[PDB]
Structure 1
Amino acid sequence: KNEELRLYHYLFDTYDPGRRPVQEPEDTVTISLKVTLTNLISLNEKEETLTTSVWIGIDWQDYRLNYSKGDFGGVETLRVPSELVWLPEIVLENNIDGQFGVAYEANVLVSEGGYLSWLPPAIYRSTCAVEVTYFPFDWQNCSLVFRSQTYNAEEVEFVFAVDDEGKTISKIDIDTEAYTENGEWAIDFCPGVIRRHDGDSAGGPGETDVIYSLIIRRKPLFYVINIIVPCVLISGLVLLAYFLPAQAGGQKCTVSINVLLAQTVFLFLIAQKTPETSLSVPLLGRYLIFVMVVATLIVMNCVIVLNVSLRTPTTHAMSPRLRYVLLELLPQLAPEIRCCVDAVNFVASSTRDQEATGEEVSDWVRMGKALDSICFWAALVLFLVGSSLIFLGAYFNRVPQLPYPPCM
């Protein structure tokens, strides 16, 4: 450390970290920015927070820290604390937790020709507005906006870093040697863009920032297995009410009302997961509400069928138009001996009246059966068509084929 201590004295015996490394005021300090993504920790939908683990490579030049390898016995590079050197105060503007700077203040590497390089890590919790229309088969655009906290475009300039071939790296870099795939989200694109705007006052100092846009796609196997398929099956169970008999002990309304109840349980389940925003309804939300309405209409229909089937003849006269509709729909799918004789005649008349009563009851039951038959096909067509139409929107929601390279 004799040479390293010599170099430290030679550099920092006279040095002011408060000041930009510029000979004149109207120079600009060009700073090469790169961002490496170690991990995409999470995307809290409820809080609308993308949590990511990143390394922030910032390179620039400081003429005050220039030196030669020969004069110091071979010291090619020197690690100093980051508080001893001037820094560009790069902050994540779109942070949600209030943390602007990096969490850990790593050392800065000072090289021979005054080149300064700083690669601190960071856990960043950025704001990401979640578009929910196609949840769980959705994709998101989460931006990370970096800017100097104090300096403007005429003092601190941003450029992207260049690879060995000289090509500009306009994207979030990913080191396979330091990347871990997220189990829920696949990154498809990650372009980067340097934006420059005019100042608040016309002709004043403008502003600049670097925005990295992560296009991320959800892997919906978990929600398909655990939320969608059970909901579809328990919803389809509502149609079985049509085959139960329309009489006491049939439990026709019990199945329908409890299926509705379970459908509301599933509503609460999706409510736990989706955000609370009101810009749009989630796809699972529309599917659930459609299926609840279908089940409610089937509860109504079961009530109507039970009403029609249990019309006794003594109170409800026979509707001829209903029977006509039924026939339409069928092809598509001695005084003491005198006392004894009067008694026997009364027996006969009573039994004939009872038989006619039973006949009219059977007719009403057949009407209920025919109505249930028709409405089963009606409800089945409605349920299947609505399920297909809702889920086809999820099927066609693919990530756009943007004019960018893959993010890998």
Structure 2
Amino acid sequence: AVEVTYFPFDWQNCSLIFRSQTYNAEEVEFTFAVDNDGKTINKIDIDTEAYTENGEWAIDFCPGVIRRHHGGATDGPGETDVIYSLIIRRKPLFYVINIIVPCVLISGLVLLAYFLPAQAGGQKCTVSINVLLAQTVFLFLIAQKIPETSLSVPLLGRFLIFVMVVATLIVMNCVIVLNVSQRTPTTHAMSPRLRHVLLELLPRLLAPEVRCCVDAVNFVAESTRDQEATGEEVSDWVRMGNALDNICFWAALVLFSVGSSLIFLGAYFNRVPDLPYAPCIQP
């Protein structure tokens, strides 16, 4: 049974159970063989010279125990077997190179969306949603590798779901920033509360012919004045969007870094426990 919790940075405890198919403990009993020096070989023996390590699995320990049980009066005749416990460690290099590192970089790309302009050509949502699409491709890739059990969530799946959630939140935030930045006076009203909170409080906390000609000139001048005031309110809207981007970049960076660090540090303290046994393969 594969303990999936820290996959691919996982170690397993695979049992090899040997017994007599025919005879009970009173009929046939087991003892461990002894070496040349008389030391009991209570473990899996491995010839060091001929041994070639598995490309993905390193055998860290391999103790053996002779168990006797079912010897009670109600149980009847006693039973016995021999259990070897291969404590094996995965070498996660393939998953690191081919899956985890590219996924980490692609998932880090969404933080770049905060630095793109909140304009038509800025392509903020392009970056965010296409990173999400790449993460879906990585979900397809990882589906072919992870175990299919449900006792716990594997670390690879947990990290992938976490970065998908972070990318979704950053997509929503980018949509909100684009909504705030593109607001026009003709269609939206200038809220003073939000402007004061973001741009003021946050940085501190952080002859009919002659008359007709004159009327035409005055009309052109007033049209230019209206254009300048409209562009000044638009500029205020872009500054508010910029401030929102500035704060939310740091928020998203903290979230991404902290979550990734905790998820991987969970594996970093998942070494094989220091058992009171000699190594399976002597160095």
Q: Give the TM-score taking structure 2 as reference length.
A: 0.95
Matched residue of 2:30: which SS? strand
Alpha-carbon offset, residue 382 of structure 1: 0.9
Structure 1 residues 328, 338: closer, same or farther in 2, change over 3 A? Answer: closer
1:31-74 deviation per Cα after TM superposition (whole angstroms, max 9, x unaligned) = xxxxxxxxxxxxxxxxxxxxxxxxxxxxxxxxxxxxxxxxxxxx
Name whichever structure is richer in helix by fraction.
2
1:167-210 deviation per Cα after TM superposition (whole angstroms, max 9, x unaligned) = 21100011124322112111111000011111587162111111
Matched residue of 1:140: which SS? strand
RMSD: 1.5
- Determine if contact 2:199/2:240 at 8 Å carries over to the other structure: no
Structure 1, unaligned stretches of length 5 or more? 1-128
Deviating more after overlay: 160-169 vs 289-298: 160-169
Structure 1 residues 203, 267: closer, same or farther in 2, change over 3 A? Answer: closer
Q: Percent identity?
A: 92
- Determine if contact 2:5/2:153 at 8 Å carries over to the other structure: yes
Structure 1 residues 251, 187: closer, same or farther in 2, change over 3 A? Answer: same
Alpha-carbon offset, residue 406 of structure 1: 0.8
Matched residue of 1:178: which SS? coil
Partner of 2:51: 179
Does 2:103 match 1:231?
A: yes
Q: In structure 1, what is the Cα distance between the partners aligned to 2:48 and 2:262? A: 41
Matched residue of 1:265: which SS? helix
Q: In structure 2, what is the Cα distance between the partners aligned to 1:172 and 1:303? A: 60
* Structure with larger Rg: 1
Alpha-carbon offset, residue 224 of structure 1: 1.2
Alpha-carbon offset, residue 327 of structure 1: 2.8
Alpha-carbon offset, residue 330 of structure 1: 6.1
Name whichever structure is richer in strand by fraction.
1
Deviating more after overlay: 194-203 vs 160-169: 194-203
Matched residue of 1:179: which SS? coil
Alpha-carbon offset, residue 329 of structure 1: 5.1
Alpha-carbon offset, residue 392 of structure 1: 0.7
Q: In structure 1, what is the Cα distance between the partners aligned to 2:21 and 2:28? A: 10
Structure 1 residues 334, 183: closer, same or farther in 2, change over 3 A? Answer: same
Q: In structure 2, what is the Cα distance between the partners aligned to 1:397 and 1:177? A: 30
Higher relative contact order (CA 8 A, sep 6+): 2
- Determine if contact 2:199/2:239 at 8 Å carries over to the other structure: no
Deviating more after overlay: 342-351 vs 293-302: 342-351
1:59-105 deviation per Cα after TM superposition (whole angstroms, max 9, x unaligned) = xxxxxxxxxxxxxxxxxxxxxxxxxxxxxxxxxxxxxxxxxxxxxxx
Q: In structure 2, what is the Cα distance between the partners aligned to 1:363 and 1:141? A: 63
Q: In structure 2, what is the Cα distance between the partners aligned to 1:269 and 1:344? A: 68
Alpha-carbon offset, residue 268 of structure 1: 2.1
Number of residue pairs the alignment of both structures matches: 280
Structure 1 residues 203, 285: closer, same or farther in 2, change over 3 A? Answer: closer
Q: In structure 1, what is the Cα distance between the partners aligned to 2:75 and 2:179? A: 80
Q: Give the TM-score taking structure 1 as reference length.
A: 0.66
Q: In structure 1, what is the Cα distance between the partners aligned to 2:200 and 2:233? A: 19
Does 2:227 match 1:354?
A: yes
Alpha-carbon offset, residue 242 of structure 1: 0.7
